Amino acid sequence: GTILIDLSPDDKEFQSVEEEMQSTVREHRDGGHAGGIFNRYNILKIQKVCNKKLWERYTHRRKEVSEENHNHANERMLFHGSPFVNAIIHKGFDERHAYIGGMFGAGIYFAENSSKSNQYVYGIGGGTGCPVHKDRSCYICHRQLLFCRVTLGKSFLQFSAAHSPPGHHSVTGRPSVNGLALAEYVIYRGEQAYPEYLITYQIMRPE
Ligand SMILES: Nc1ncnc2c1ncn2[C@@H]1O[C@H](C(=O)N2CCN(CC(=O)Nc3cccc4c3CNC4=O)CC2)[C@@H](O)[C@H]1O
Ligand SMILES: [Zn+2]
């Protein structure tokens, strides 16, 4: 069921998505070890992801969350990086693949910082880098991120240095040390996210 529609760079949606991508880059505490060294991206393509089945599954779960939370879905647009981006656009997010814990347990993780999600494109901690050059800071190979619509509902606030918590629909990882970091979020149901844009890009070598 999935089709990908290419957005023209003149399209206002292309521009607003690119801007969210570029404006949410930050420096990382690993000095670029996992995701490479860059201050900005070269955006090659932005595709709208269209799948009726996945979308209806999302909206159904969204209405359920909403009715449990005074008609407030608490919906965000957030980044997701993964080696399995092709499976996600075709089959949706699936929480059964969330074995190993990150900071907030076995769940599906999303980031406000595009550069944080970029650290996971080639695997946990960047894995071994691009498949062609084995370089976590490769400037040649094309990368992809998803920009996703995520239902947070009532989110458990975790100050920060499986199931949702009882009475909650998600977890929010609030940074409590690094003053420039944006939040990360965790959901425990795959139907609480819809992978709306597929962005293909390169990281750019600083001048
Ligand atoms: N349909 C599917 N087929 C194959 N893999 C699928 C899938 N749906 C989700 N996944 C994948 O399962 C994986 C998963 O849940 N995991 C593995 C990693 N882990 C740590 C984590 O996600 N940290 C983390 C923290 C902050 C941002 C980002 C990430 C990952 N991507 C980001 O943008 C939490 C549990 C994940 O890598 C996801 O992409
Ligand atoms: Zn490469």
**207 CA to centre of ligand 1 in angstroms:** 32
Which residues make up the environment of ion ligand 2, defined by Cβ < 5 Å? 130, 132-133, 138, 140-141
Comparing CA positions, the residue from 118, 92, 122, 125 lying closest to residue 196 is 92
Tokens of 38: 């860059």
Residues 6+ apart with CB under 8 A from 140: 130, 132, 133, 202
Q: What is the resolution of this structure in A?
A: 2.0
Comparing CA positions, the residue from 133, 172, 175 lying closest to residue 156 is 172
Q: Known binding site for Zn(2+): residues?
A: 130, 133, 138, 141
- The CA distance from 99 to 207, in Å, is 40
The closest ligand to the CA of 131 turns out to be 2
Which residue, by CA, sits nearest to atom 29 of ligand 1? 109
**77 CA to centre of ligand 2 in angstroms:** 28
CB atoms within 10 A of CB 84: 11
Element (H, E) at 197: strand 193-203
- Is the Cβ–Cβ distance between 133 and 36 less than 8 Å? no
Residues 6+ apart with CB under 8 A from 184: 103, 104, 109, 110, 111, 112, 116, 172, 173
- The CA distance from 98 to 101, in Å, is 7
- Does residue 184's CB lie within 6 angstroms of at least one atom of ligand 1? yes
| Architecture of the 1-207 domain | Alpha-Beta Complex (3.90)
CB atoms within 10 A of CB 140: 10
**Residue in the structure block whose two tokens are 């969204």:** 62
This structure was determined by: X-ray
Q: How far is residue 158 from each of residues 68, 136, 162, 183, 194, measured CA to CA in Å? A: 21, 30, 16, 10, 24
